[PDB]
Each structure stands twice: as C-alpha cells, then as structure tokens.
Design a protein around this nucleic acid. Structure first.
Length: 51
DNA sequence: AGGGGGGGTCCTATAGAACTT
DNA sequence: AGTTCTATAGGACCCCCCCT
C-alpha cells in the first residue's frame, strides 16, 4: 500500500492506547501513522493481516 | 485560507508476496 | 533481480469546535 503494514509493536501500542481511550488523532501523532490504518485496524485487529 | 482540538470519507499507488527469469 | 499482482496506507478532501 502507500505505506508499510503495522508492526506488532505499533499494533501493540494501538491496543493499549485504545484501552486508554486515546483519540484517533492523538494516536496517529503518537506513532506517526495515518488515522486510516489506525482506524481500520482497531475496528478489527484480528482480521488485520487476513487477505 | 492560520494555529490548536475532535470526527469523517474514499481515490490510488504501491508494499510485499508470490512467481519467474 | 525482475516481474506481476491486489488489498491497503496515505492523505486528500470534508464536517464541527475554540484561539495567542
């Protein structure tokens, strides 16, 4: 895609951050990733990588 | 028309795998 | 090293707030 897929770490952060109720926008800033990936992934982290 | 904050959409090249030399 | 492939990351464009 336009960028690399999410690393286990990145996705790991994302999981915690969500737990912390961080905002999408802050999340991106935090790990320098588009809201887009972040969004999609959190909507279903499992399904990520299933293609 | 900016900076900051929150949230969408959705086009579109390309990551990265599978393959072929 | 090149090919060929397509689901997907980027980020464009949108909505709404308030302000050194």
């Amino acid at each position: 895609p336009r960028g690399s897929a999410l690393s286990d770490t990145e996705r790991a952060q994302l999981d915690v951050m969500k737990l912390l109720n961080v905002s999408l926008h802050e999340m991106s800033r935090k790990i320098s990733r588009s809201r887009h990936c972040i969004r999609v992934y959190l909507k279903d982290p499992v399904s990520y990588g299933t293609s």
